[PDB]
């Protein structure tokens, strides 16, 4: 799998409250986190299905 799939989630400095998904390779799962709306990293998906498609 791509290296970015190993990143922990990055909320960023923004104050928005947007649910996004990251791939947790240790758990083999797509997991929800709250994203602040700015400075997204690569392991940041709109849905669990998208995270799994890229990283599973």
- For residues 48 and 1, give the distance between their C-alpha atoms in angstroms, rounded to a whole number: 16
- Cα 11 from Cα 1, distance rounded (Å): 22
Way the structure was solved: X-ray
| CA gap 4, 34 in Å, rounded | 18
CA-to-CA distance for 40 and 35, rounded, in angstroms? 8
Q: How many CA atoms lie within 13 A of 1 on its CB side?
A: 16
Q: What is the resolution of this structure in A?
A: 1.3
Measured distance CA(12)–CA(18) in Å, rounded:
11
Class of domain 1-56: few secondary structures
Q: How far apart are CA 15 and CA 55, in angstroms?
A: 27
Q: Is 2 exposed, middle or buried (0-12, 13-18, 19+ CB in 10 A)?
A: exposed
- Side-chain-side CA neighbours of 32 within 13 Å: the count stands at 4
CB-based burial label for 17 (10 Å; 0-12, 13-18, 19+): exposed
d(CA 16, CA 49): 22
Domains of the chain, by residue range, sit at 1-56
């Amino acid at each position: 799998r791509p290296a970015f799939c190993l990143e922990p989630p990055y909320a960023g400095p923004g104050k928005a409250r947007i649910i996004r998904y990251f791939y947790n390779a240790k758990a083999g799962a797509a997991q929800a986190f709250v994203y602040g709306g700015v400075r997204a990293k690569r392991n940041n998906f709109a849905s669990a299905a998208d995270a799994l498609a890229a990283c599973a």
